[PDB]
Write an enzyme that holds these catalytic residues in place. Structure first.
Site, PDB file in Angstrom:
ATOM      1  N   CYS A  23      56.141  14.299  -8.596  1.00  0.00           N
ATOM      2  CA  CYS A  23      57.490  13.907  -8.979  1.00  0.00           C
ATOM      3  C   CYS A  23      58.139  13.073  -7.883  1.00  0.00           C
ATOM      4  O   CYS A  23      57.958  13.336  -6.691  1.00  0.00           O
ATOM      5  CB  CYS A  23      58.341  15.138  -9.280  1.00  0.00           C
ATOM      6  SG  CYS A  23      59.757  14.776 -10.332  1.00  0.00           S
ATOM      7  N   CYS A 285      65.916  14.248 -22.016  1.00  0.00           N
ATOM      8  CA  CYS A 285      64.531  14.170 -21.569  1.00  0.00           C
ATOM      9  C   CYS A 285      63.951  12.799 -21.891  1.00  0.00           C
ATOM     10  O   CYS A 285      63.362  12.601 -22.959  1.00  0.00           O
ATOM     11  CB  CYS A 285      63.701  15.278 -22.220  1.00  0.00           C
ATOM     12  SG  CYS A 285      61.980  15.370 -21.684  1.00  0.00           S
ATOM     13  N   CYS A 327      66.733  17.794 -20.357  1.00  0.00           N
ATOM     14  CA  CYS A 327      65.864  17.558 -19.208  1.00  0.00           C
ATOM     15  C   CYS A 327      66.348  18.494 -18.104  1.00  0.00           C
ATOM     16  O   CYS A 327      67.179  18.123 -17.275  1.00  0.00           O
ATOM     17  CB  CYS A 327      65.906  16.095 -18.772  1.00  0.00           C
ATOM     18  SG  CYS A 327      65.056  15.741 -17.216  1.00  0.00           S
ATOM     19  N   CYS A 334      57.894  21.844 -18.442  1.00  0.00           N
ATOM     20  CA  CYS A 334      57.986  20.491 -18.988  1.00  0.00           C
ATOM     21  C   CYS A 334      56.824  20.190 -19.921  1.00  0.00           C
ATOM     22  O   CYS A 334      57.000  19.525 -20.949  1.00  0.00           O
ATOM     23  CB  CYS A 334      58.032  19.462 -17.857  1.00  0.00           C
ATOM     24  SG  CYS A 334      59.595  19.390 -16.963  1.00  0.00           S
TER      25      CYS A 334
HETATM   26  S1  SF4 Z   1      61.994  17.538 -19.366  1.00  0.00           S
HETATM   27 FE1  SF4 Z   1      60.447  17.390 -17.704  1.00  0.00          FE
HETATM   28  S2  SF4 Z   1      59.085  15.679 -18.362  1.00  0.00           S
HETATM   29 FE2  SF4 Z   1      60.972  15.515 -19.625  1.00  0.00          FE
HETATM   30  S3  SF4 Z   1      62.295  14.065 -18.464  1.00  0.00           S
HETATM   31 FE3  SF4 Z   1      62.885  16.161 -17.783  1.00  0.00          FE
HETATM   32  S4  SF4 Z   1      61.601  16.529 -15.936  1.00  0.00           S
HETATM   33 FE4  SF4 Z   1      60.671  14.745 -17.019  1.00  0.00          FE
END
Ligand code: SF4
Ligand code: SF4
Lengths: 391, 391
Positions: A23, A285, A327, A334
């Site tokens: 990340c 997200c 998100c 995730c």
């Molecule tokens: S939910 Fe997880 S994969 Fe989706 S944007 Fe957020 S951090 Fe990224």
């Protein structure tokens, strides 16, 4: 076909498709800490890391590379044990010291703020000297250590790409440059290397394989493995969501090389387009939404070929299915969301949804526009999310 | 179990589990239009229908019964072709006239507002006469021509239900009253009768059957069929989401009657609990979230029995998976979302997600509380949604 279109698309593909090691938030933290350039990490009296809501949220429980640990403290320790020259790859070649973790745990004081991307480190030692560094804004522009270095592209080219239509993308995947073919193959290689074991395999059918492979790669990326992921716009989970569903669909079907290459290329083009159209920051997200739009367009191109109405119907059904989703930061969970994305893509290949149904757009372009506008409407939620996680 | 607890649970189950005939919004519109009591619908010069954001959203593209059409214009035509004495059943026994649809399309001017349920019709004819009607607040309360209707269970009982724990629900499903058994059987019968064909069947496995049956019943309810649905908290789609996944899991597995009854009863209890705790209005898809929490708790009770850690893990994985989906109104696409819900439930039966992963709660109650809090934070947002849908 057209020359300027091919040149622009090639340049933007070369720009947005990179290799991200985990990340970007933990990499950012480690890079800032190494930019402080502490000569002896065991002579530290206090460290003051300042993050914004989004950064703290994304980095709270994500795996830190080469540490086999989770959280922000491993990222800070790796930055202390890293070199600034590695930039976002700060965790390369390090040897994690649990002693340094226990030393810094008593001294790392983290404070969150409400703002865009902000990463400020302020370290003091036993002598009394202080060292400050800061990375600010969405583009990773270091303002205090002044170390020129990410992945910048001027606004004119972004605007020209936003004005492209899906037919331009469908005609590009027929005249693919050789460098772009190798880039797509390298993408497939990098993202397929992320498959380590089984995470969510509940069958042997196509959707089962898609969910299984996507969740396995996402879990591998989230536990802090020292393996890069081919990321579009520095979001590795978005690249996983965009590529692996198509890889597993092709693995379960025709096992065609050139066809998988073209489908993944179209998926990456669609993902770059959706990222450009979603210009405003958002707590939705973006990985699921954008990477799944790319994945469903690629899967529909694999299933029906260069059929415009099939692609529009797939986009409409995807927009009807799973738009708008939280998100809540980089986490092992995730993967689950990406699994849902797989579903959202697969179920879109067998159902047509009328344009009148809610936020569904008239075609692919309107679907992307509506998803982006809804993302803008959801607004800043990272403050409340970080308030939830603090308990 | 305690006696007062059982009495309260029985009362709340008998109150919240009802039988709802189709979509209420098009009925509202048709009833308001019919209250004008137009003698000749073809003598109309202009119609001015006023709705609030929520009503316009829910009735924009939902199937109108006995019209073979979708949208608000068919509801207006049916109201013109109906009698006000039929109240919310204005579309009963009608014969849709395409000529009247083409006539009214040129004159129906719809205007959206920001308020609670509001439906105001203002029609003018060729002579010059004007006809007004208005429905405000609840569904059944028309203020013009002044037929007041006040909207069952006091707030103290709701608060007492909020303070119940999952063990209370697990002990209730072992000493079920006979009336409650009859209610569960009628619920299963009513919701299984909504299955008309295949809508999203991509296999014969358990998840395939779950998604197929749930989407088939939801599509049957959304196209305007004259078939009632057993609704939890007057939300028929929420009741579908809470019951049908468990029905199809039992259909694909052990085919146990009493076990399915107990599982669906626990699902309804959990759905009512999540609806009570999410007291504030929200544009998030309450059906998916609440009914899917109920469905995943019921599926986990079916798979592992009265296991507290199994249920906590299922709830945590569900919370990690699909929270914060948009509710863009009653539509044929709603089924897709419920399909996703099925996925979100099934995938929770085989994966455990740590509470550290984002908004995931420590147990079931904390998961429900966090989901409710995010729903409350999302707010109304219906104005922006209708602004998107207005194109
Ligand atoms: S939910 Fe997880 S994969 Fe989706 S944007 Fe957020 S951090 Fe990224
Ligand atoms: S989107 Fe969700 S909450 Fe809205 S009508 Fe459909 S099922 Fe119900």
């Amino acid at each position: 076909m057209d020359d300027y279109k091919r040149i622009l698309i090639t340049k933007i593909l070369k720009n947005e498709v990179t290799e991200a090691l985990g990340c970007t938030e933990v990499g950012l933290i480690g890079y800032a800490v190494s930019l402080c350039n502490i000569s002896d990490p065991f002579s530290i009296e206090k460290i003051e890391l300042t993050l914004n809501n989004g950064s703290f949220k994304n980095a709270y429980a994500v795996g830190v590379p080469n540490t086999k640990k989770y959280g922000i403290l491993p990222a800070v320790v790796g930055g202390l044990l890293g070199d600034h020259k590695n930039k976002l790859l700060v965790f390369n070649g390090i040897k994690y010291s649990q002693k340094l973790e226990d030393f810094i745990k008593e001294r790392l004081k983290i404070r969150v703020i409400n703002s865009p991307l902000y990463c400020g480190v302020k370290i003091k030692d036993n002598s009394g000297n202080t060292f400050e560094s800061l990375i600010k804004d969405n583009h990773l522009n270091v303002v205090i250590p002044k170390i020129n270095n990410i992945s910048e592209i001027n606004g004119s080219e972004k605007e020209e790409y936003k004005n492209l239509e899906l037919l331009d993308f469908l005609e590009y995947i027929d005249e693919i440059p050789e460098e772009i073919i190798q880039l797509v193959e390298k993408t497939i290689y990098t993202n397929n290397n992320l498959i380590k074991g089984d995470f969510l395999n509940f069958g042997n059918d196509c959707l089962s394989n898609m969910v299984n492979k996507t969740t396995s790669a996402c879990n591998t990326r989230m536990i802090g493995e020292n393996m890069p992921a081919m990321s579009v716009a520095k979001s590795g989970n978005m690249g996983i969501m965009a590529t692996l569903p198509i890889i597993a669909y092709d693995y379960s079907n025709e096992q065609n090389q050139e066809k998988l290459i073209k489908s993944i290329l179209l998926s990456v083009l669609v993902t770059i387009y959706a990222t450009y159209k979603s210009s405003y920051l958002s707590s939705m997200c973006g990985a699921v939404s954008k990477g799944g739009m790319g994945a469903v367009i690629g899967l529909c191109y694999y299933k029906n070929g260069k059929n415009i109405k099939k692609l529009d119907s797939a986009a409409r059904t995807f927009t009807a299915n799973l738009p708008g989703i939280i998100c809540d930061g980089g986490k092992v969970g995730c993967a689950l969301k990406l699994a849902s994305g797989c579903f959202a893509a697969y179920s879109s290949l067998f159902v047509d949804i009328s344009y009148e149904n809610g936020i569904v757009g008239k075609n692919f372009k309107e679907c992307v526009e509506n998803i982006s506008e809804i993302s803008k409407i959801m607004g800043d939620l990272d403050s409340d999310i970080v308030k939830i996680m603090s308990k």
